[PDB]
Amino acid sequence: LKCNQLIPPFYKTCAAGKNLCYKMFMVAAPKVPVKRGCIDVCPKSSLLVKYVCCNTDRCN
């Protein structure tokens, strides 16, 4: 799996174990992403942090 990330080259091949891509948002600023990359499990969202995860190359 390959996921998009904020730092160049803007994408990265996930190590074994990480089969999900994710994007993290901070409330009162959804338009702007805070973190993007590979992950093992989709973190639970809260009132202050939101997570969106997908499982195909560069889907995040």
What's the CATH number for 1-60?
2.10.60.10
Whole-number Å distance between alpha carbons of 56 and 47 = 27
E strands within 1-60? Answer: 2-4, 11-13, 20-26, 29-39, 49-54
Tally of CB atoms within 10 A around 37: 19
User: Tokens 């089969």 identify what position?
Assistant: 19
Burial label for 54, CB within 10 Å (0-12, 13-18, 19+), is middle
**Bond prior to 8 in cis (omega within 30° of 0):** no
Indicate the resolution in Å. Answer: 1.6
